[PDB]
Amino acid sequence: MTVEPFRNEPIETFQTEEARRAMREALRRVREEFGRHYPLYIGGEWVDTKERMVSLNPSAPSEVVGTTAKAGKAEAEAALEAAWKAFKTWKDWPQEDRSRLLLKAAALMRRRKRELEATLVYEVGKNWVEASADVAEAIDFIEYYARAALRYRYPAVEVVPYPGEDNESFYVPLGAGVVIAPWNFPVAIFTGMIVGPVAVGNTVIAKPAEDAVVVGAKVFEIFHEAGFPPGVVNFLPGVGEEVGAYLVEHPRIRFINFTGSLEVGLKIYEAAGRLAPGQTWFKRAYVETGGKNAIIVDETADFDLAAEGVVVSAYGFQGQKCSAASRLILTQGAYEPVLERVLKRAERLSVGPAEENPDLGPVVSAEQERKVLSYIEIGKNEGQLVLGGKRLEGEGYFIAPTVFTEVPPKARIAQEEIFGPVLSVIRVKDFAEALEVANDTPYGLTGGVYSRKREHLEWARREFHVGNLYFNRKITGALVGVQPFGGFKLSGTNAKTGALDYLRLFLEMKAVAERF
Amino acid sequence: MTVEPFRNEPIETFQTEEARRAMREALRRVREEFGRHYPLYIGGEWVDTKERMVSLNPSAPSEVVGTTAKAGKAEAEAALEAAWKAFKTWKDWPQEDRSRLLLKAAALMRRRKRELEATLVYEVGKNWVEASADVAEAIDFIEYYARAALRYRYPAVEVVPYPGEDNESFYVPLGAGVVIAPWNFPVAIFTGMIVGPVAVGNTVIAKPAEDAVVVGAKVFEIFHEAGFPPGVVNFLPGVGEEVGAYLVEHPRIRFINFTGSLEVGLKIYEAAGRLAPGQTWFKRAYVETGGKNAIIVDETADFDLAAEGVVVSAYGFQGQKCSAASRLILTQGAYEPVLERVLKRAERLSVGPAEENPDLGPVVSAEQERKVLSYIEIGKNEGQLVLGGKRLEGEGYFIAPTVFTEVPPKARIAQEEIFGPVLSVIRVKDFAEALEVANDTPYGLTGGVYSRKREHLEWARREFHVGNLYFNRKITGALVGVQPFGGFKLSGTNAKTGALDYLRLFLEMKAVAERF
Ligand code: PRO
Ligand code: PRO
């Protein structure tokens, strides 16, 4: 099967009147459908429950954006039975056939781009460009994994020949597994975590994050329209731990793909290491568990370029990203000039309802608001608050861009992941000290350096211990194919999304010899 | 660096007078050197202890082959410090430099080959050809991994370009880890499990199996002469679980490479899943945990050819192989002709001191004798003893080749790994039933089919769920490079040894973008 070489889906900037009109049409369509109820999707059919879950607009939380069915253990067991039944034949599809199905799903998703973007705007508080980036990344995962799976097709393995025998090694998929998806990229990461395993012949039960169940259901409408056979993909919105715990601990769950907090990721990895009664394999658990990502700037940098990249990295999607710059490490020569520029830029950021395309929407929920404001209270005790640090007026969960300065490297706000619009600025003497401070966290996801000094950049290339490092640009928005995405240390298992190596995680290898 | 394409090291059959002359001298010299003492090897030096461990000759256990120092937690901690210190610089060696070091080690091992084979004969009771296959396999791991490692060299990752930027993804080693090696291939598997991680820039602390400490020490004389820098490889023989437990559970152990019993493998995997106090990463654990491997024969097979392969597979090295045929699954039309031929061949097998080059030597220890004899007693209930089932006369741990017939598929002897010369014969109707019985164990390591029917062979290729499958040939003796070795289910994590994929398990990936 031959398609165009992979290109990333263009992220809409909405600079043309047509693009803006198309977005306004989509927003209107989406809000007109706020009354909709979305069931579970199990074994090729939409399956409703008596209990329901409600999704709220975090920019106006008295407004409901939709409701969904709510799965429990029994629905979890039913999806597991459907997923294994499906696996029996889905594993046997030619890779070309599986990859074409993915390419169909991508095309369907591309045609519904604005609708999904508008759903992100209303359901999770993404501004328009954050929304467009999220949907473009989802399309990219589908496009990329569809192609990358072909690189593993029967029989892919390079082996040494032997006289008088055929020796053939090849990959096969693992089985049925569970995906536990985050709310912050509930199209992109939700989609990538499902379609990667699915591309190469696995089957998946997906649990969306509670805050993003409506957009996950809309992704499943796309899967259903594309024609995935019954049981290949399954959708189980649920409240709290019930569904996730039941499946993670199940003797018949083959693998777990998780993106979310370190707290939950640790529990998952530990549970995966245990043999449940009657289990007959060693579970694979892939976890991406957040970061405490720093940007270093030294005295040689373009200070204006740095301040722009820092503000984008710190406050894009309200800093609710595993890749967000939450630390700003400035050498002595860079300290005042860069801090001054960041403050002047950050003070001009708009905050408001996401549908108006502000620089910042609200944080995602009342619980998130609580967590972020709690950390602000801690930061006031630990460093010097110099911008923001408060809730803004409106029912929506609006928090001001916040900056603490003179923060000790080992302070709680310089160590713990806040996941909100809070930047901690750490002053150091020189680049050596900057690198020490950068590395001295439990995390290792993203990181950045602004500097013109080649020796410093190349030193960072070798020694700034993060899985995704960026020089003289923002540290967020890793593109599928371009920047394999995944971290070190307590940022997770280094399962690199948007890379050829990702699909290998969902395969095992068989070696078959025939002596003639 | 450019070397000849990989070829497997030829396995000596000792058919020429030249080869027998050389082997007789090597065995005489090793026998003459019984009682030698070998210290620990930590941080580039031999380090002795007050306590010592004794390695006996299983063919004559009143004879001490040699003694070694005995490591405790203190020595384990010293080796860990030495390994991390070494890693700081070993990680930065050009890959060509690391690979040349491995090629030197291989050359030295090749030059000491008859001595190493003789040491196996005496220390673990391998006959001459089993000893030569084992040493040849070790040389192959070194040669193979030295070349495979170059395929990962900076910057190896295929990425999609982006305008105005360099995007560079590359692999880095993980750090210091522990190798826990088996007694049954204590040159081959010991060597491969250590040099694989080491080749790509990791550092290793290696715990040999207690029954094979002397030959492990001679491998370390080779590492030393080759000139691995201090701390890069460390040798810690020890008694019972203290050393392995201390390292497996240590917050500063990065990875665990284990080959051995399922019982121990399960505990290791569970422990690796936990975050020890102060730990700052998710541990990787690679485990290969044995098999209950079957050969199926249908009525279309060459019955003479099948009987030969079955007897080699079941009784080679006294059946003490994770790859050994311990089940013989025969369709109704194959049953009588194949069993007759197996019995006639098996009854002709010699059993005696390994130095004599018998068909079978002793089992490895008093504990193994006890375990295998205990399983024979179990089998006498569950099946019908038709051959052997007894300890033979002598101080050595001699056990007769044993056959049980009419064994129920779910019998303990048809499900549990005995790791001795004990074959369970299972009657089935046809090839479909043969596959069902083959698959219905907790394991999935090796398997074989003797059949001339193309449709049966290709059906098995798809459905006989083992990681190493062989048609019309023995199911043991997987060759490095030719047959990537590793299983499914409770045979372990499918870390395929002797394959390009193995080295990827000891690396993580960094993605570094520069915007110009
Ligand atoms: O790097 C980022 O910001 C997004 C989130 C996961 C990967 N792409
Ligand atoms: O297949 C075999 O018999 C040995 C065991 C480990 C791989 N080579």
Ligand code: NA
């Ligand atoms: Na919501």
Ligand code: NA
């Ligand atoms: Na011994």
